[PDB]
Amino acid sequence: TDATIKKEQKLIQAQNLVREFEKTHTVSAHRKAQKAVALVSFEYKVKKMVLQERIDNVLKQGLVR
Amino acid sequence: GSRSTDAERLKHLIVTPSGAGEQNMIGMTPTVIAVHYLDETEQWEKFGLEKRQGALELIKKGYTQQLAFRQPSSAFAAFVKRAPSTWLTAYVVKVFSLAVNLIAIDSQVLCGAVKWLILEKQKPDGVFQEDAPVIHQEMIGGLRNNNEKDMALTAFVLISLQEAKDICEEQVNSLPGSITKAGDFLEANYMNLQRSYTVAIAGYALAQMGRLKGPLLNKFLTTAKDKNRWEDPGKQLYNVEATSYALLALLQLKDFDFVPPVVRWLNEQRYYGGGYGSTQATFMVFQALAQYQKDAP
């Protein structure tokens, strides 16, 4: 069931990095956030969608370096 | 580290993707790699931070359009009713894997393609076969040469699976074993290679799984001309592509002593990609230079 832990971790990682992105708005942060989210299991399809939407909204606001 | 490649030299790489299953990837390639390179060398500020969002918009456009050619099996071809291409499906995996850092990419589209390649196109001996060559033979780079096709194609596909591993690990149980088998094949025939191209591409494949050493590494290193390039008598584009694969191998090995001359040679070629038949050379030279910028001390 380590898979359960792995998947939860990915989800945690993605959430943190997405939050981090909403904070800094940088290309570096965008990239980490986007890849992290890409790694979230389909099991979390809903929050994965919510997380992607959050990424899309930060980009809609514009990046700064 | 050496100076980065001036962003101004890459403005022609932001392209609109169009055409069918192959052509869409030919257009998607330059844009994806240009953003990838500009991101790594942080040249957006001194170039146009707003142009990035535009490029990203074009990448999304390329991605969605590519999905129209995803067949029920998860494989790709120029047209949905055309027999699926091993090379193209592998290339789509290659490009989408690098683009995972730029836009939303459905893991099941990526891993579905991976699964298909393993289940349908890999022989029990590990080799990967192409049963329906792409129309645009000019987009496959050095793999156009007919000699050592089994090694070259197996290396190419293995590279794709390796670059997709992180993304597909948890959903493709057979991925680890497929990679092993592919590696075994490359290993048992590596010493017999005659083309600098195959040596380079297979070298990178083997280096990624820590199997490029002993006499194989010696072969790989000694194949280079003047210790700065991997070339064969043919199109110069193939050598640029080959040497780029070689740079990626050296970086994978952490052989930073052999790296400087190679990077210097690539820069001295002043090859900024784009144009008919530039697909592999464009993607590889910049993936390699970006990696160099990222890793090199």
Curated annotation (Swiss-Prot), chain A:
<comment type="subunit">
    <text>Interacts with host fibrinogen alpha chain/FGA. Interacts with host complement protein C3.</text>
</comment>
<protein>
    <recommendedName>
        <fullName>Fibrinogen-binding protein</fullName>
    </recommendedName>
</protein>
<comment type="function">
    <text>Extracellular fibrinogen-binding protein that plays an important role in virulence. By interacting with the alpha chain of fibrinogen and its derivative fibrin, enhances a non-functional interaction between fibrinogen and platelets and is responsible for repression of fibrinogen-dependent platelet aggregation. In addition, assembles a fibrinogen protective shield around the bacteria which results in impaired phagocytic clearance by the host.</text>
</comment>
UniProtKB/Swiss-Prot annotation, chain B:
<protein>
    <recommendedName>
        <fullName>Complement C3d fragment</fullName>
    </recommendedName>
</protein>
<comment type="subunit">
    <text>Interacts with CFH. Interacts with CR2.</text>
</comment>
<feature type="disulfide bond">
    <location>
        <begin position="111"/>
        <end position="168"/>
    </location>
</feature>
<feature type="cross-link" description="Isoglutamyl cysteine thioester (Cys-Gln)">
    <location>
        <begin position="20"/>
        <end position="23"/>
    </location>
</feature>
